Design a protein that fits this description.
Helices cover 26% and strands 21% of the residues. By secondary structure, it is α+β, with helices and mostly antiparallel strands. It has one domain (1-86). Helix 2 (31-40) runs antiparallel to helix 3 (66-73). This is Messenger RNA-binding inhibitor of apoptosis 1.
């Protein structure tokens, strides 16, 4: 704190994924989620304690900038850093 330009402010994004692929993020100690956090310096938080009428589970993202938050957001929509099975 007390920086001449740095702040505690951070970016945020939120999206839903069907429960049929939550295992593509949390299938092993969330090591796949932690790989996306090291790939974009972002942070990610799945919320399996939540479920919409869509039956899907939501997830959230945090980063220093949208230039780092959007790259982690667009990765989970198709690559998931574990979708190599297809």
């Amino acid at each position: 704190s007390g920086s001449h330009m740095k702040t505690c402010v951070v970016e945020k994004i939120k999206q839903w994924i069907p429960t049929t692929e939550v295992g593509k993020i949390l299938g092993n100690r969330a090591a796949v989620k932690k790989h996306i956090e090291r790939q974009f310096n972002c942070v990610i938080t799945v919320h399996t304690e939540v479920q919409s009428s869509f039956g899907a589970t939501p997830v959230e993202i945090v980063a220093q900038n949208k230039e780092q938050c959007q790259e982690a957001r667009n990765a989970v929509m198709s690559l998931m850093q574990s979708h190599q099975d297809k």
